Amino acid sequence: EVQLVESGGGLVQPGGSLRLSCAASGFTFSSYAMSWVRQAPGKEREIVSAVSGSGGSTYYADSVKGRFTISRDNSKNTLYLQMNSLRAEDTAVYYCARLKKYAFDYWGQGTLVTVSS
């Protein structure tokens, strides 16, 4: 089966950078792809990063296609996210979620990013 649960907690003032992650165990995270994030303080969802398929597919929020990163930790039960670009004016909340068929329908806890300031 799949094991997991978003988590981490980091700050991201304007030009900051957060460090969160998706929990995971037997299925790991990249072995079977895994996408994640999506939520916010009445700020509508907001992804941060994902890795569909072997990884050819990758996500970075909706404005950091090149300024975000789907960091991962295979033998650590989780992958992390270095997401910098916020602006002390848009705190957010995320929720992990896989997406490769046969392994899509889990990840449901709630995490976030506090633009330090």
CATH topology (fold) of 1-117:
Immunoglobulin-like (2.60.40)
Task: Classify 76 as helix, strand or coil.
Answer: helix
In the block, which residue shows the tokens 């988590």?
A: 7
70/58 Cα distance (integer angstroms): 8
In the block, which residue shows the tokens 């705190």?
A: 91
How far is C-alpha 11 from the chain's CA centre? 14
In the block, which residue shows the tokens 């996500």?
A: 59
Domain ranges of the chain: 1-117
Residue 2, phi then psi, degrees to nearest 5: -115, 145
